[PDB]
Design a protein around this ligand. Structure first.
Ligand SMILES: CN1CCN(c2nc(Nc3ccc(O)cc3)nc3ccccc23)CC1
Length: 470
């Protein structure tokens, strides 16, 4: 700062890549730790494990996003390469002193070992620790990766790192090995279907309160299991999506299936009074979703009534009681103007909640599309790290809602029912979409002044038990 100190004496870049001189051709920063904009993967690794200071924000963001520019096996190889630092060639005077015997090592070599080698090696062990702690799925998905890591840390010498090595081992041990209520949850609610009778379960025979509760528990669990890296690089939309984004895909597919199931229930209710009762029941379920701050569920139902097969059923909507219509329309309004009213509601509510997941997916897709993976250079193009940082900012928002358990008891049969929903049957999504629309045209034909009469299908009461608990 106010005086330049003597430089460290480093090995040559020909024997150790990471000490190649910084330039705009291999590392770039944004405009007290400098913020990395991009670099070669070698320079990114160097800064990930920099000798001058720790960089926890970079370590976290790097480990969340690196799979978009570097393979897991490749990262391990780079970190091992970083670790195995060669010492500079002894100078002629150094060689004299060594041969003379019982002389201290050179001042330059002492500085190098203390100020460069030991800090870098400890930073590498720190990265390993965060990697297995927060991203152990990399090692679950790739057995050779874990075996390589374990083999490497067994090879490390010196008491200075045994604490670190054993700490990494301990985390790996705990990972390899792998409900209470503070206050009593409310009693499970039952309507026509009774405990154990899972063969009779259906939208109108289950209790609307309990449908909403069990779906909220399910959706909360799905949401909680999504890892940020499943979103980075839009990997859930690419070739290896089933391996890279399993929890995200489960969540998306649940939402698709549940929305289609609500639509199916409505349009397959050919009897007019029955159909009005089905839509009314779905609005009651929406109310309880709302009460539970499950906005994922609220917007699944909004999506269902916006669908082209349902939205066109004007006679059905007109027959809704005014209070339920108002409730439905206030929810639909949450989504209007790019989810403006939803977004203000999200920022105000208290946990537990289940956020609408769609808005994160949309924003991530835009960000991935709207930023280049590389910074263009005359030589090798640089990895655009600032792009990854922007994505990680979005995934960080998802995480803030993932540790909020509901005070609701699971109903195992109802849970299985909702996990196993298959509205499409054997149909393709396209086939099923056409099926819904043609059924819609059948039950309320174009330009029909009154919906034709279809016979009632079930014999049970259409009367709802309501959404007040007992
Ligand atoms: C032209 N259609 C459009 C679809 N549709 C909906 N109506 C209402 N509200 C309403 C208010 C006053 C009324 O007298 C009757 C209905 N809300 C909806 C929410 C979502 C999806 C469709 C509708 C029926 C009318």
């Amino acid at each position: 700062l106010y005086f330049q100190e003597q430089p460290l004496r480093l090995p040559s870049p020909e024997v150790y890549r990471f000490v190649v001189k910084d330039s705009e051709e291999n590392i770039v920063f944004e405009d007290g730790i400098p913020i990395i904009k991009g670099g070669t993967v070698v320079k990114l690794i160097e800064r990930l494990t920099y000798h001058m200071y720790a960089d926890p924000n970079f370590v976290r963001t790097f480990l969340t996003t690196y799979r978009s520019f570097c393979k897991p096996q490749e990262l391990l190889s780079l970190l091992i390469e970083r670790f195995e630092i060669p010492e500079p060639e002894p100078t002629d005077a150094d060689k004299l002193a060594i041969e003379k015997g019982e002389q201290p090592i050179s001042a330059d070599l002492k500085r190098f070992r203390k100020e460069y080698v030991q800090p870098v090696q400890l930073r590498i062990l720190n990265v390993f620790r965060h990697w297995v702690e927060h991203h152990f799925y990399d090692f679950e998905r790739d057995l050779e990766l874990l075996e390589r890591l374990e083999s490497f840390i067994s090879s490390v010498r010196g008491k200075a790192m045994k604490k670190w090595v054993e700490s990494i081992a301990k985390i790996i041990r705990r990972k390899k090995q792998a409900i209470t209520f503070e206050s009593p949850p409310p009693p499970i609610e039952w309507h026509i279907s009774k405990p154990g009778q899972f063969e009779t379960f259906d939208l109108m025979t289950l209790h609307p309160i309990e449908i909403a509760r069990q779906l909220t528990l399910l959706e909360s669990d799905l949401y909680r299991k999504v890892q940020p890296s499943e979103l980075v690089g839009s990997v859930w939309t690419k070739e290896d999506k089933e391996i890279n984004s399993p929890n995200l895909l489960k969540m998306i597919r649940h939402t698709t299936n549940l929305t289609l199931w609500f639509e199916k229930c409505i349009v397959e209710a050919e009897n007019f009074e029955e159909r009005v009762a089905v839509l009314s029941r779905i609005i009651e379920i929406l109310q309880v979703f709302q009460d539970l701050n499950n906005f994922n569920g609220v917007l699944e139902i909004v999506s269902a009534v916006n669908s082209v097969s349902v939205y066109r059923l004007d006679h059905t909507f007109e027959a809704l009681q005014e209070r339920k219509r108002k409730i439905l329309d206030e929810a639909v309004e949450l989504s209007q103007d790019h989810f403006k009213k939803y977004l203000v509601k999200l920022k105000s509510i208290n946990p537990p909640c289940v956020p609408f997941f769609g808005i994160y997916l949309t924003n991530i897709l835009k960000t991935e599309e709207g930023n280049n993976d590389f910074l263009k250079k005359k030589g090798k193009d640089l990895i655009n790290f600032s792009k990854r940082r922007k994505v990680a900012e979005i995934t960080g928002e998802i995480q803030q809602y993932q540790n909020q358990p509901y005070c609701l008891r699971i109903e195992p049969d109802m849970r299985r029912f909702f996990e196993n929903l298959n509205p499409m049957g054997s149909a393709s999504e396209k086939e099923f979409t056409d099926y819904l629309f043609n059924k819609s045209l059948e039950i309320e034909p174009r330009n029909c002044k009154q919906p034709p009469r279809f016979p009632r299908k079930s014999t049970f009461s259409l009367k709802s038990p309501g959404i007040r608990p007992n």
